Structure 1
Amino acid sequence: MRLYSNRDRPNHLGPLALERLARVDDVVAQPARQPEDGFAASEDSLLGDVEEYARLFTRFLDGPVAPLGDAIPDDPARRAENLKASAYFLDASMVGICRLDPDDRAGDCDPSHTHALVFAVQFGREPEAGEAGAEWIRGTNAARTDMRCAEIAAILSGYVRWMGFPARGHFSGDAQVDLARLAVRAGLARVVDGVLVAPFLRRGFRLGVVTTGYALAADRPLAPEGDLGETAPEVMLGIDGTRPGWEDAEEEKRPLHMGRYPMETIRRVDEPTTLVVRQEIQRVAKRGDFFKRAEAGDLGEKAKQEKKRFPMKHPLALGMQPLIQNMVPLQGTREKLAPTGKGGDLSDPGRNAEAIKALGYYLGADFVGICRAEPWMYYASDEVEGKPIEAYHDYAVVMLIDQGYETMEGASGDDWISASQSMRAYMRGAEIAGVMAAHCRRMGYSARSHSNAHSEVIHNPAILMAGLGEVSRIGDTLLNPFIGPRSKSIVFTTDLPMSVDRPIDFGLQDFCNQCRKCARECPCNAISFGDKVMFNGYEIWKADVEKCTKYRVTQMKGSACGRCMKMCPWNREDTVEGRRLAELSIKVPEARAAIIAMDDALQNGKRNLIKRWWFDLEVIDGVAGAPRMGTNERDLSPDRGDKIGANQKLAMYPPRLQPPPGTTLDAVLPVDRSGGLAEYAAAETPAAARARLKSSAG
């Protein structure tokens, strides 16, 4: 939570006030090492698990280089900006660039590399002694942070390669250059008693590097002696939109298992705020996921042909792809395992829940919750062989990763960066859950993660039962009171016993009932302007998933879409002013209509041009080029009818209109749009459902 907005600050400058520190042109080099853990790891810890994912990311530090197209901007200052903004987008804490000199190119480094992108990732917060999970995490920060450096270095390496320039990533596990030296030269750190010290990162950090012949404007080293200006009043208050100087210390007062956002102040309820009738919920084949439908031909030729490609049109997304795909085989086991003895005392489920949450926040989740994995949350059958899926684990641990407010401010929602937002949050989530599930397995509890590339559960109902969101108008997206609908979830299921969270009520039903903004702004009118309906046993505002799927897969003026998330009033900057509007919305019902109307009069959702840090590049046949058909640049739309609720006819595809369990990708089942439209018109009202259920319980 900042005090001042960053709405006028370009993304390449990052969340810290690096531009206010004292700098000089050059410094004298000297021996230096990276920060290490204070304490050593206890015997059984997370160490083995973060090391496995670090080895995996090591494989993608190099790779093939695409041919050079003609759309890469020449100016090294503009390349520098974009690459620093890319690194902040992946959650580097600090970024700089320096020139590579002959002492660096003389080792195993490719001799055509002239430049280095240098980035730091801050150590995560550790639990205190005696807190749940302390022994899992204590002493693993170098390795946990290295794994994240490797991930970032691989993704960015891969981006530059796909732009057509050779590039290689480096980190402590695998480096051909002196990392520490470069961090000094690029102006991230200074040396104290042979150890790097970085302004603002008081917990310690580790480094990643990308070397490349892609020429870039270089930064200047920090002044080597004395105070740099990190406590000047402008910096302490963060007037330009940066982190206040006391934010770290205020956050450290909260125990790590509570997260950064105060989810403890939200009202909990036993039953969710919308009707869920478990006995009437049928399980759905994986083959009914509408992307799988698209893949198999159910939605027509165009959609079939675009399905592999639609989210991989931008080079940055293609940098992520190999990590995403190769995490899949590590997702874990469905079989029961024997407890192992490792992991300290596991007999208290309340403490286990705290430990798992802490672990999630240590690895970088924004929200962690836990619910029972009910059988109706698992798909009925897989889509490749058509075999039944068993409800094999008892618990679902559900994490939210924020898609990134600032990037989205700059975007249309359906332009060239949309899919990269999705993919970054899927990638990061899969990494976190992979590690966490792996840790459960090392303790002898079966655990398996469920990513965008391979999932056997439907995230939504778990997000709901874990109390991380309420049902919203957008439809197939649940909304959180602090980051709104701006998230991707990741889930791992496991048998580790844990107390469960409970659903939340923060007044969203009433708020969404007076708002239509997401619906108004959807490019294909997929989002309902009317009332909630019953759908496969539960109450929901059902969007038209056919129309949405066709637009996201097929539209040629960007890479997919998430405009609905962008335009929602609950999607807000992490500032005091933002948080206060969220609190008003929750605590003061009379204010909601006013907030809804003012969100428009203030032009929230307008594209903010300062935040547009990315290049409009479309990869066609292995080469990046300017967008063939152009680029979506949408603005706010005017109001629709008072009568649009009554006139819009959407289709819905509950189980009866889906491919049945057992169907694979080899079969085709053309979508029955007629039937889906008539099914929507026949859907039961929630009110009638409530009364029908009451009439049985007499």
Structure 2
Amino acid sequence: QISMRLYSNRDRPNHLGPLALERLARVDDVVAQPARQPEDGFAASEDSLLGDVEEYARLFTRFLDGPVAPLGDAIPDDPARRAENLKASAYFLDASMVGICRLDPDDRAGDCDPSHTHALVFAVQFGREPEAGEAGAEWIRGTNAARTDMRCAEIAAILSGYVRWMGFPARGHFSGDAQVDLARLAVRAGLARVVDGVLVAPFLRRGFRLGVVTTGYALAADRPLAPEGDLGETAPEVMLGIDGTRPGWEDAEEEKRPLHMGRYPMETIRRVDEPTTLVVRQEIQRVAKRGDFFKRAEAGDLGEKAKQEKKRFPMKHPLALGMQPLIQNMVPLQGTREKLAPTGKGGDLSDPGRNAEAIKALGYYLGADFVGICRAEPWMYYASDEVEGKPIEAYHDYAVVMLIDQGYETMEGASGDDWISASQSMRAYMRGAEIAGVMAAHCRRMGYSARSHSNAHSEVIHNPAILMAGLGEVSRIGDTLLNPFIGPRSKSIVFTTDLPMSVDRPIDFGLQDFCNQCRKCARECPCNAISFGDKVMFNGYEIWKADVEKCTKYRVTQMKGSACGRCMKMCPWNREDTVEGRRLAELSIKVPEARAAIIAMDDALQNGKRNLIKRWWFDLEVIDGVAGAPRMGTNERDLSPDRGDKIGANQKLAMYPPRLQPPPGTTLDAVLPVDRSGGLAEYAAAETPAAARARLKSSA
């Protein structure tokens, strides 16, 4: 596998994007000409997904406009910086290409707010589709303009919302709902040129769709592409991607592998029948959803301050606030628990092996980074809901599990617990919920009960499903599983379904041995919540149990950022997607004698250092509905020194297995103060995985 970047983007600012657009021939202006956006070649069947992407696009269309916050005193005046920040924001949300142009009076002449002076124009490339006769092609064929339009609506809704929260009027636009000429602005803003009356964008050879955010927030504008001849797309520097940009051969190489296999070579990872850590199903008790520690915080179990801050902590930054409406309003579309009758739609659904591939291909098409499938075992479901306290049924047979990468480059510039941390969480949550909502819906159209399980609302615990789906191994971080290619840098989305699918198997890439000789995450945790010691048994399975009380308290109540995820940032497996980055992961996996050295050199080379070039976001905290400079400051953490040879023996953490949780009937209306002293003792009394194995062997 040769398609990864040879060159690092460490010195590339985020506003420049993954493409070498700065190397393309440009002119000051070009003459407008009529043009339309790319469309699908083939039309979409009745047995296709089109209705579902159209529904989510309609949902997001609701947030293209909204209320404008009061203007605070903390927004940068410089339009160049403003432009950079907004381009970076759009790339962070996976715009393919971004540009900015001035609006003229023909543009405001229409329904568009006449206060609007500038447009942020972005393109999203068409998804890859399954080749003909591949599983799921008929689900997907002819849905790409609409699938891509949904993504545009989503991005335009978030970005327009972000600028409105900074105190500037702003409106998002896309094909389904636009007040301006999208194609005309794509050309002016320098993303496309016209060929035979249709837009053609350098680099985006699969076709694409547009979004726009028009606004009075003044921005430095871009220049159009030279209107004729060669733009420089194949120049040697662009082709090799010398500045850290996407290699010219990458698209072609990637199209060589089937869509259903994903971009990362997970087929090269060793599969195993039982997972790499002990799982004793007969001893796994089910947990009240009221024992989720965010619910415990919400109910008063962790004290007043945590209770107060529980709703607010991830929504302190305008960007996150821009996502909130989409996140909350997707919840009613999550789907059904009741058995459905097969509708005959969806093609040949008799091979589970092909259904698995179809579902995978579907997820990758929609933008998942990993897709894995396991049985939705009943102990993966919460025991009861936190609102009424009613039992939750194990209503579906299968879990489809997908990982959304939280973003390497952004996190590289971040402290992990600064003003962007929750935006990295919420982006990944929002994108995952959108994708799983669409896929669950499609399953329903085919007559197979399906429900997604998001941040806002899950009735399963994702972790054991990530494990059983072969998407990660247990890591020291604790309540995070670690994937061999994106490390711990993900959020999962799960949807459960009755659709028959062949299931994946657990993976073994040596992580247990690796984490046994690493402590980096533990050392770098602001509240010392991560264990420096050995794995323990906990509710019938082997785990490194973090202190979820301390972590929750820090994430919810710390005031120098918006939440925390520093532990993902500091992990050696959190690496750049270069040849060297991949080689270090391949070595970690394949060469045990090298692991200690890799661990040590991760620190010697100061990996985890904050990269000032990558800090593209504004430090803004919304207090009382108005964005301002941070009241208490901003975490700007650096690599930390060793804790000691004896820390694993001396650190005492608290654990909260079912016995110390609110029991299965309990609702948010009750308070159960966290029993920290009992949790300390519980941990001290936890059985060792060794002892457990001996114990289980004596009943064999």
What TM-score do the two structures reach when normalised by structure 2?
A: 0.99
**In the alignment, what sits opposite 2:397?**
394
Matches of 2:501 and 2:486, distance apart in 1: 26
Q: Deviations over 1:327-384 (max 9, x none)?
A: 0000000000000010000000000000000000000000000000000000000000
Q: Deviations over 1:44-68 (max 9, x none)?
A: 2010000000000000000000000
Match runs of 1:131-530 below 5 Å = 131-530=134-533
Matches of 2:341 and 2:263, distance apart in 1: 34
Q: Deviations over 1:467-489 (max 9, x none)?
A: 00000000000000000000000
Q: Is the 2:416–2:564 Cα contact (8 Å) retained in structure 1?
A: yes
Q: Deviations over 1:72-102 (max 9, x none)?
A: 0000000000000000000000000000000
Q: Deviations over 1:17-61 (max 9, x none)?
A: 000000000001100000000111122201000000000000000
Matches of 1:640 and 1:340, distance apart in 2: 60
**In the alignment, what sits opposite 2:68?**
65
| Corresponding residue to 1:554 among 553, 557, 564 | 557
Q: Deviations over 1:416-462 (max 9, x none)?
A: 00000000000000000000000000000000000000000000000
Matches of 2:6 and 2:17, distance apart in 1: 16
Q: Is the 2:158–2:322 Cα contact (8 Å) retained in structure 1?
A: yes
| Corresponding residue to 1:681 among 679, 684, 694 | 684
Q: Is the 2:293–2:548 Cα contact (8 Å) retained in structure 1?
A: yes
Q: Partner of 1:303: helix, strand, or coil? A: helix
Q: Deviations over 1:674-695 (max 9, x none)?
A: 0000000000000000000000
Alpha-carbon distance, 1:164 to partner: 0.2
Matches of 2:116 and 2:186, distance apart in 1: 17
Q: Partner of 2:494: helix, strand, or coil? A: strand
Q: Deviations over 1:510-549 (max 9, x none)?
A: 0000000000000000000000000000000000000000
Matches of 1:512 and 1:280, distance apart in 2: 25
Q: Partner of 1:81: helix, strand, or coil? A: helix
Matches of 1:532 and 1:602, distance apart in 2: 28
Q: Deviations over 1:192-232 (max 9, x none)?
A: 00000000000000000000000000000000010000000
Matches of 2:342 and 2:486, distance apart in 1: 37
Q: Partner of 2:330: helix, strand, or coil? A: helix
Matches of 1:459 and 1:41, distance apart in 2: 33
Q: Partner of 2:160: helix, strand, or coil? A: helix
Alpha-carbon distance, 1:583 to partner: 0.0
Alpha-carbon distance, 1:307 to partner: 0.3
Q: Partner of 1:530: helix, strand, or coil? A: coil
Q: Is the 2:168–2:216 Cα contact (8 Å) retained in structure 1?
A: yes
Q: Partner of 1:399: helix, strand, or coil? A: strand
Q: Deviations over 1:102-147 (max 9, x none)?
A: 0000010000000000000000001011000000000000000000
Matches of 1:374 and 1:44, distance apart in 2: 30
Matches of 2:508 and 2:247, distance apart in 1: 31
Matches of 1:448 and 1:40, distance apart in 2: 28
Matches of 2:558 and 2:132, distance apart in 1: 53
Q: Partner of 1:368: helix, strand, or coil? A: strand
Matches of 1:650 and 1:42, distance apart in 2: 56
Note the residue ranges of structure 2 that are not aligned, 5 or more in a row: none
Matches of 2:680 and 2:178, distance apart in 1: 58
Percent identity for Structure 1 against Structure 2: 100
Matches of 1:163 and 1:28, distance apart in 2: 34
- 1:666 matched to 2:669: yes
Q: Is the 2:417–2:565 Cα contact (8 Å) retained in structure 1?
A: yes
Matches of 1:44 and 1:369, distance apart in 2: 23
**In the alignment, what sits opposite 1:579?**
582
Q: Deviations over 1:593-634 (max 9, x none)?
A: 000000000000000000000000000000000000000000
Alpha-carbon distance, 1:415 to partner: 0.1
Matches of 1:440 and 1:127, distance apart in 2: 18
Matches of 1:337 and 1:268, distance apart in 2: 33
Q: Partner of 2:698: helix, strand, or coil? A: helix
Q: Is the 2:452–2:496 Cα contact (8 Å) retained in structure 1?
A: yes
Matches of 1:627 and 1:6, distance apart in 2: 29
Q: Partner of 2:585: helix, strand, or coil? A: helix
Matches of 1:683 and 1:694, distance apart in 2: 19
Q: Partner of 2:630: helix, strand, or coil? A: coil
Matches of 2:616 and 2:332, distance apart in 1: 34
Q: Deviations over 1:156-195 (max 9, x none)?
A: 0000000000000000000000000000000000000000
Alpha-carbon distance, 1:317 to partner: 0.1
Matches of 1:671 and 1:649, distance apart in 2: 16
Matches of 2:45 and 2:376, distance apart in 1: 32
Q: Deviations over 1:547-572 (max 9, x none)?
A: 00000000000000000000000000
Q: Partner of 1:437: helix, strand, or coil? A: helix
Alpha-carbon distance, 1:640 to partner: 1.2
Q: Partner of 1:188: helix, strand, or coil? A: coil
Q: Partner of 2:319: helix, strand, or coil? A: helix
Matches of 2:234 and 2:332, distance apart in 1: 47
Matches of 1:209 and 1:658, distance apart in 2: 48
Matches of 2:221 and 2:611, distance apart in 1: 27
Matches of 2:510 and 2:325, distance apart in 1: 41
Q: Partner of 1:321: helix, strand, or coil? A: helix
Alpha-carbon distance, 1:3 to partner: 1.1
Q: Partner of 1:523: helix, strand, or coil? A: coil
Q: Is the 2:96–2:123 Cα contact (8 Å) retained in structure 1?
A: yes
Q: Is the 2:44–2:143 Cα contact (8 Å) retained in structure 1?
A: yes
Matches of 2:6 and 2:248, distance apart in 1: 11
* Aligned-residue RMSD, C-alpha: 0.3
Matches of 1:220 and 1:103, distance apart in 2: 19
Matches of 1:145 and 1:359, distance apart in 2: 14
Q: Deviations over 1:305-335 (max 9, x none)?
A: 0000000000000000000000000000000
Q: Partner of 1:412: helix, strand, or coil? A: coil
- 1:46 matched to 2:39: no
Q: Is the 2:46–2:345 Cα contact (8 Å) retained in structure 1?
A: no
Matches of 1:383 and 1:41, distance apart in 2: 41
Matches of 1:55 and 1:305, distance apart in 2: 34
Q: Deviations over 1:650-677 (max 9, x none)?
A: 0000000000001000000000000000
Q: Is the 2:334–2:440 Cα contact (8 Å) retained in structure 1?
A: yes
Matches of 1:166 and 1:525, distance apart in 2: 43
Matches of 1:135 and 1:58, distance apart in 2: 27
Q: Which 4+ stretches in 1 moved above 4 angstroms?
A: none
Matches of 1:411 and 1:349, distance apart in 2: 43
Matches of 1:43 and 1:367, distance apart in 2: 28
Q: Partner of 1:696: helix, strand, or coil? A: coil
Matches of 2:643 and 2:306, distance apart in 1: 29
How many equivalent residue pairs?
697
